[PDB]
Structure of Bifunctional P-450/NADPH-P450 reductase:
Amino acid sequence: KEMPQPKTFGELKNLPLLNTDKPVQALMKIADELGEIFKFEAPGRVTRYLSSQRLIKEACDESRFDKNLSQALKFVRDFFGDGLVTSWTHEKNWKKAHNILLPSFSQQAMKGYHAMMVDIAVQLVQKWERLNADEHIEVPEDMTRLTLDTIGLCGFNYRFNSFYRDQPHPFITSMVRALDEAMNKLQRADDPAYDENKRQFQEDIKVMNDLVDKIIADRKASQSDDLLTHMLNGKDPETGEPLDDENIRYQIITFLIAGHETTSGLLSFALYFLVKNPHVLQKAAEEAARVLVDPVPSYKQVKQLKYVGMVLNEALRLWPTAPAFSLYAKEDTVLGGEYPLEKGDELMVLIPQLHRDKTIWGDDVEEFRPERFENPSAIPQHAFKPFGNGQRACIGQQFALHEATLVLGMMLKHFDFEDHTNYELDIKETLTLKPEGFVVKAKSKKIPLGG
Ligand code: HEM
């Protein structure tokens, strides 16, 4: 079969159809018109977007396709190096860090992290219990406070103390401002008009490096067992090698950013869909009230919040917060019996489109219906992939979902929510998705906390 393709405009190819800062959302609308696969060309580059479970399942066969570094990931590699997210599966440093870091997400590790997660969740609830009449909550801003602090604490025994600041931690502002200047620099014709941009970039990189320096120095000057411990002390069983110090610095930055942004998005989306679907908010609050009987939640109690877990999966269905991942053909091959590819050809999984495949989910794909996930073992493999695929799947998946389930649980135990502005979904796309400007009011149910 000839591969569908949007209209090309001479040497600009398909680039005129993607002049937006919401290109995932734009590509979903091209998918709706062209179907399960389309080629997209810009000057310099070609990739093929996949939207069906039929073809994604084939693309997920790791004997034929491996993880690719998309244009975004190649850019980001300048900051994150050969950390876990930005390495090739054929880079020595990928498998080496995988083996050394996997145990930080063992069952005994998750249990270990739970009291630390509770510490941060309790700070969120207290903040909201402390608001005055008529005050409101900036939802993704407060979710980012919680998730940054959680990964700093759990991963690194470092307190960002985000709840003590009315603005973002400088680490976050600096990361974002350095990323933005690196992108902005890419499209500039050394006019000394850019002397301040360059000084600010050097300041921003120094804030990041100073933090990483401190996390490492503080720990060496200190007994712990967390991610940072395995980074510093762990040896790969395959080779006996430890991480080198360059790679360690890349892993710390990698984990501080990856370990919070998508989880903050998920919590923001989940509360959005709850306030827009009040019969579902009622069902999830009934569960939270029935299960979370103690002043603070135990591990076991979080695991019992089944409907809250369904909520979160349904939010990840509709708006997976890392919405695309990329693959390449390891050898010449034919995709779906219909589409010849050459070695090296790039495929992009458009996760939110996959998650709208009506052949799999039925026609109600735009409905927020957590009951979909009642029996998740019956969902076909590769229909639902908010955590990517195979050996390059999310190492943080259980961490993210425990944090989210604990925090959403506690939120729904402690407050009623109001969508006071009748907020209109506006999804901002960066390295992740978030409902920009999402705000609510909370009214305390006056249930006390444990001390
Ligand atoms: C809802 C929250 C999350 C989502 C939706 C998610 C999504 C993903 C996706 C789709 C991938 C595959 C990327 C690719 O194929 O290019 C990935 C990989 C990765 N994730 Fe997450 N993530 C979440 C939370 C976390 C957390 C909490 C951590 C850290 C604790 C984390 C760490 C990582 C790491 C290090 C990798 C690279 C693993 C590898 O290639 O070895 N993620 N994640």
